Amino acid sequence: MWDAQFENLLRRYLPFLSADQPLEQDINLRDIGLDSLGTVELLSELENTYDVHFQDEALTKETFETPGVLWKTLSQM
Amino acid sequence: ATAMLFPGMGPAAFSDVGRFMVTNRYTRELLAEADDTLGYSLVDRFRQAEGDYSEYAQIAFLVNCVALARWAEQTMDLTPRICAGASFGEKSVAAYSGALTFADAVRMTAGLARCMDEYFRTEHLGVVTHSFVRAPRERLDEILAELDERGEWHEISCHIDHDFFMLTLHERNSVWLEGRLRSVGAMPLYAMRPPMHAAAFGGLRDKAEEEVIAPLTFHDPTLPVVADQDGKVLTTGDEVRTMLLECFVRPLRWPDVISSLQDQGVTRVCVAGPDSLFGRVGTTTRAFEVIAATPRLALQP
Numbered sequence: 001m002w003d004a005q006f007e008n009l010l011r012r013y014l015p016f017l018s019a020d021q022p023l024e025q026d027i028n029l030r031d032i033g034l035d036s037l038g039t040v041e042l043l044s045e046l047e048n049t050y051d052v053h054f055q056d057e058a059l060t061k062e063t064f065e066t067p068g069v070l071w072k073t074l075s076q077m
Numbered sequence: 078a079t080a081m082l083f084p085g086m087g088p089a090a091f092s093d094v095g096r097f098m099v100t101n102r103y104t105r106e107l108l109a110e111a112d113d114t115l116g117y118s119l120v121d122r123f124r125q126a127e128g129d130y131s132e133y134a135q136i137a138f139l140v141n142c143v144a145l146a147r148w149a150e151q152t153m154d155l156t157p158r159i160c161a162g163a164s165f166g167e168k169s170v171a172a173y174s175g176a177l178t179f180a181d182a183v184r185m186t187a188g189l190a191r192c193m194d195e196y197f198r199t200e201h202l203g204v205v206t207h208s209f210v211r212a213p214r215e216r217l218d219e220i221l222a223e224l225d226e227r228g229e230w231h232e233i234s235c236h237i238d239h240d241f242f243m244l245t246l247h248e249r250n251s252v253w254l255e256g257r258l259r260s261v262g263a264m265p266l267y268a269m270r271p272p273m274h275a276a277a278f279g280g281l282r283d284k285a286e287e288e289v290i291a292p293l294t295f296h297d298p299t300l301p302v303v304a305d306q307d308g309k310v311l312t313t314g315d316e317v318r319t320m321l322l323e324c325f326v327r328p329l330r331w332p333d334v335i336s337s338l339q340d341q342g343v344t345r346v347c348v349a350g351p352d353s354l355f356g357r358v359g360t361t362t363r364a365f366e367v368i369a370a371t372p373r374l375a376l377q378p
């Protein structure tokens with residue numbers, strides 16, 4: 001279970017999710033609008049905001065499949 | 078000062094563009110000319126296509142891209158000094174710029190699509206083009222040297238930004254390449270088939286010349302066109318013919334196109350069409366104010 005700092009950030013990259021719609025844990029980010037360059041800018045904002053460096057398995061597409069896997073993967077740093 | 082930019086192809090479906098193509102009057106006009114030229118209903122064959130990048134999808138992208146440029150010009154009263162097209166977009170600018178009639182550009186696009194499919198049916202099997210980011214040249218060189226070390230063939234096929242490149246090579250090395258990229262913080266994007274932009278494809282270049290490009294009549298453009306191979310401002314039909322050919326065997330150099338544009342006085346850019354890359358990448362962003370002329374934008378009131 002994540003917080004509002006994470007989610008406000010993440011929603012700036014999901015154009016097909018409306019502000020009045022919840023971010024489900026298992027929802028697929030590609031279908032909700034995240035694309036290649038979005039992912040890139042999203043990595044960027046996460047690495048500043050949280051002072052981490054993504055690497056090795058954290059750079060596979062799988063990391064970015066859902067908010068749930070992405071939050072999990074991020075917490076670990 | 079403003080420029081007109083035509084983007085490369087990217088991931089999408091008929092659902093994304095279908096309402097636009099059937100509703101916008103620019104596109105309807107162009108679809109009519111395209112049908113009369115191909116001998117079929119483009120929209121109908123695109124509608125029922127079983128791919129991401131069929132022939133029919135490619136011609137539809139041409140049409141959408143050109144119509145959106147005509148659409149942005151009238152809607153937003155743009156008065157472009159100069160234009161440019163990346164990769165697939167070379168074909169878009171040819172038609173926008175006046176280097177070919179729309180009908181020849183449709184023929185062209187259709188011919189080259191068949192021609193790529195024949196060629197890559199048997200040639201350079203297993204070769205792929207990898208895109209990746211967060212990879213400064215320093216890091217990429219280390220990887221390439223490790224590839225040279227094992228005697229594995231490769232070619233840098235595109236320069237997108239300082240840390241954003243495309244590399245072509247046998248798919249046998251893909252998984253390792255991916256893993257090794259990630260080791261140093263680089264992120265794999267996509268692994269494209271067919272491949273594109275390599276000296277080793279001079280064979281494809283000849284076949285597009287003989288089977289498809291040679292019969293066409295090119296005209297000098299009504300505005301100059303910046304070549305995506307190296308930032309050269311072009312001004313004649315024959316220079317536009319050449320860019321379309323060199324494209325198969327010379328790598329795309331997007332920081333060079335941005336350079337010329339800046340050097341020719343350009344402050345602002347309109348990117349015509351659906352766009353996953355060239356209108357969004359930092360190389361374009363840091364230099365210019367961007368107007369994204371996408372089917373979504375053309376369906377607001």
Ligand SMILES: *P(=O)(O)OCC(C)(C)[C@@H](O)C(=O)NCCC(=O)NCCS[C@@H]1CC(=O)N(CCN2C(=O)CCC2=O)C1=O
Pocket residue numbers: 035036037085086087088130135163164165167189208266267269270271273321324325353354
């Ligand atoms: P993420 O998956 O959201 O984004 C990935 C990425 C940003 C790389 C996105 O832009 C992408 O997927 N690119 C699409 C690559 C792809 O799969 N293309 C398939 C082949 S199609 C297109 C058709 C075509 O002919 N070209 C160029 C060929 N060409 C020239 O460039 C000049 C002359 C010529 O024939 C295409 O790009």
